[PDB]
Amino acid sequence: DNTVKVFFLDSMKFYLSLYGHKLPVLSIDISFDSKMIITSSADKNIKIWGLDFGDCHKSLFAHQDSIMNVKFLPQSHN
RNA sequence: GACCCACUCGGCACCUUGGAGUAUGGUCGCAAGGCUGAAACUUAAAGGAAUUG
Question: Please, what other remarks does the record include?
Answer without folding.
Answer: Present with 9620 molecules/cell in log phase SD medium.
